[PDB]
Amino acid sequence: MRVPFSWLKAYVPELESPEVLEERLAGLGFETDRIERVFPIPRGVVFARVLEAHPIPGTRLKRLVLDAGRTVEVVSGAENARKGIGVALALPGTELPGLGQKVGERVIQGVRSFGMALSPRELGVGEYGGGLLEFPEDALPPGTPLSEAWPEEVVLDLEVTPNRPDALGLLGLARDLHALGYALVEPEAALKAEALPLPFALKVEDPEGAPHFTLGYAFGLRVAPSPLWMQRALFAAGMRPINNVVDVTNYVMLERAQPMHAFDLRFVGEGIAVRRAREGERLKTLDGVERTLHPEDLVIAGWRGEESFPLGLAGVMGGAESEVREDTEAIALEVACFDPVSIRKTARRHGLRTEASHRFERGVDPLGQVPAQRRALSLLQALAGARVAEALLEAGSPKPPEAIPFRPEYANRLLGTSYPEAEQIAILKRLGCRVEGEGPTYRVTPPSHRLDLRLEEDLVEEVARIEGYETIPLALPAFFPAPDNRAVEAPYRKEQRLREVLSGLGFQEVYTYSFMDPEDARRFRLDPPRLLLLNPLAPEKAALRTHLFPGLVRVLKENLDLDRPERALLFEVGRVFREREETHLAGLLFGEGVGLPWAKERLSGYFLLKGYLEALFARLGLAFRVEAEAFPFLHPGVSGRVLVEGEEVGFLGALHPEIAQELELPPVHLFELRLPLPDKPLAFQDPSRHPAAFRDLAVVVPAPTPYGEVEALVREAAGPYLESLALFDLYQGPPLPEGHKSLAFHLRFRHPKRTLRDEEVEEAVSRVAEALRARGFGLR
Amino acid sequence: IPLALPAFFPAPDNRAVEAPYRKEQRLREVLSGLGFQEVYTYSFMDPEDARRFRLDPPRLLLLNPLAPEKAALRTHLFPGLVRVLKENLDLDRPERALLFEVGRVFREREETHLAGLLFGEGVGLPWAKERLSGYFLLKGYLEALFARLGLAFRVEAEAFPFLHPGVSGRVLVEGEEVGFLGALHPEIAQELELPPVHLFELRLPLPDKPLAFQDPSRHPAAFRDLAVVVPAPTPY
Amino acid sequence: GQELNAIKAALEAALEAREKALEEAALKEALERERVDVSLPGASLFSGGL
RNA sequence: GCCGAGGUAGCUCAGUUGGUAGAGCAUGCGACUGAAAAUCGCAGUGUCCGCGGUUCGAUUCCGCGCCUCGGCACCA
């Protein structure tokens, strides 16, 4: 919200400086995004009085005769250029910010133009440039420098959180600075009303949308441009003056965050009717935009006899037709409180965001209407010499705020402060509360405008802030946590250790968007996502990932394309989605492999990974083995499942060739387990100090058989006294049958208490040869 | 006497006092990562090992040793790392072993040391005879190690009375020398009746390189090969 | 149009034919060749401890 | 949900009297090496966003919707 320092300083007279105000608003709950000086007006621009505007024949231009102290003429193509208004005359030799090159005497369509009459854009007071500024013809003595009556201003840019719609009005904002001890000056709308009947009737048909609706009646109006202080103020706040009436409505709105709108009675008909738009009805709003109306739009309509037409999009923006102009003498002033939701909906339905809707959405004082009507009516009487009526037209009877039980004891308990009761009650009373209490728990009833104060905690907040969060002391709580909180962080320290361990061996951690490309569902041969999005950043990021590798792999391609990593071992721990959210660990190997920077002999591929992985769970002290399984995304030749502590939890293999080919990628290996990994409790076990009888023994087996089944069998029948095992060599050669291979194991037996005799080992080494036969294997 | 818990902000000269600790700890944890098996060994030293491993005699001795074998205070971590090896190979016959130990050494001043030890067949395929090992296997892990710590590391041949003259140099972390890396002197292994063996022993705390992030260019890296014929005696 | 034709009649037929031809020639060698006993012990990297 | 600009070969990207869909590392067989590199011809993975048009190989008129951006209106 733009906050013109001087505008504020009008309600809060003693403000120190734009700087201090920002410091002040800071502690109050509003931070300023920026501060800036705004109306640098060179000495070259003076006030002038359009004596006469003469149309240059043949052109669309005008020769203006202006009283600029002495008389001068200027040429202008501005439609709004007419006789009897004041203007910002830039004399020849003036340096304008808005158009940088030096203004001077120039001949145009036959007339020695003496400088030019500026426009909002040209003076640098607003972005508008479709007309000249329009000052009150008698604004200043012809020729006086404009700055002399239009000083450089300072505007703060304040962030106004939703819990402070009262703050979308400087008089409201001002009320907070007051509580800090700043003198407050509320304008005293000085009305001179006349007890006479209103020429129109009110007929609120949707009290649900217009909980409180009031209409004013000002007549015998003399529409003209606003005085400079008004025009200057509106501009600093980001708005452009338009006249007498319209300006006072906007002024008040900004002042007390209460949108209002002057409807011209010529168009009001018999009376104003606040109803919903008849599904169909058309309305051309102020922006010149011709719109259709959704039957849910709350309309401000007028009726004539048996007719009914819209006049304005209630709470959002007035209608183009009934807006007040120069030839208007009487108006019907709208000042109401509209259903926040209705406005919200409608505003967006028509893609409109006004100063009006913005406030009606956030929240309007449920009982600030009438005071507002007088402020506007007063001002209209003073700037438009209007003759305000005495009676309003109300529709709705809102109930003032209820009391809130407030214990300054708790305030100090909840804050860790020890503010004396007195300071608290005092503050609360400065923010406009009624503290009807005796102690210890008072009956605090807040101001109609504080929508953010319903609870006793709300109130305690008011003390902290007005007292200064910087006054709340530092401390540290000490207590024994409830028992169901012990060890709650195991799941965490577990996974963390994990990562840490991986990062040990050599894996590079990697984070990847939870998003998934629906296409990759086919591209990597996976099942389509169950959770999709209703608002994807991009179809590529349309669904939620069901695996971690599609990404791990993609980050690879992307690497090899920006840089060409000769090799890469990666890993990622992330949340996957599918039936249920579940944590996964993913890995990825690729490149030359591990060996000697020189000596061509490299160690890599599938078994390099299974290498690390076995080495991995080795570290975690967990059972690990792979058992070939078909996985639609892995080379059929190299693809199995992973078995941690006996239970299956993922897979390990090489990416399906057909795939690598599409993503134009070399061969690659990976795995993707599911967390949390099994939990094996440790059982210490004293190791025997008696020598381990160990013997070798090959096992001729048929080529199709997996080393897994072989060992499983050998170890099994190998007996309990079996310490180790091991596979020191696999041979598929000459002295062996067709389609066969021998697995030479290095066994090792051992007894706890005493040494063992070879008569025992044989009775075992044999038991291993017997089942090795009963099954169907040889024994070289 | 009731239970309670004190609550206070510690005096400022107490902030971060535990860095030195979390540092070394991380260290161990990192080593244990790659593949090193931690090992604790009596601070005691056998005065004889002073000669047996060719080291300088201890400066701190004892006036009441548990046994002359445990008469002095260790001046190195390897004599022990190695001994625990012999002792292993004799009770069990580890086919291989990568070990490490972090402990306090004594000499002029007490100082923390990190010691390693590789030995055995090496890293390869349980079957396929092709093994990857020895000196360069260790320098392998070690380079991989400081790689993890993001620290400069390189070796530069230096004579160390306890390492094969053929394979013996010093270790340079972040440019500053702090230890050594090589293979145990053959003559020694022969006495303790031990096979070949490799080791290293740095001194803690390891250098501290502050990190300076550096955006990597998104523009292709012009790269080219080029051999360099050099005389056999020159070091890479 | 003789070229507008041949330029199309050739680029699509040719360039793609040879591709898909090898796209099913190379991807074929692998599928068949590469057959491993997955459940076979792998590289013996060391595994630390504390 | 308004004006206006870009979205093209493992990558960085200009472009438009058009024969250039390409230039700058980088990349694919012979052959100089044991294995490479600085090399000489010989060449284009490119749907120049996607659905449809556009000349003898189209990027560009041209249609609507998409990745990108400034401002704008909100306020992370």
Ligand SMILES: [Mg+2]
């Ligand atoms: Mg509050």
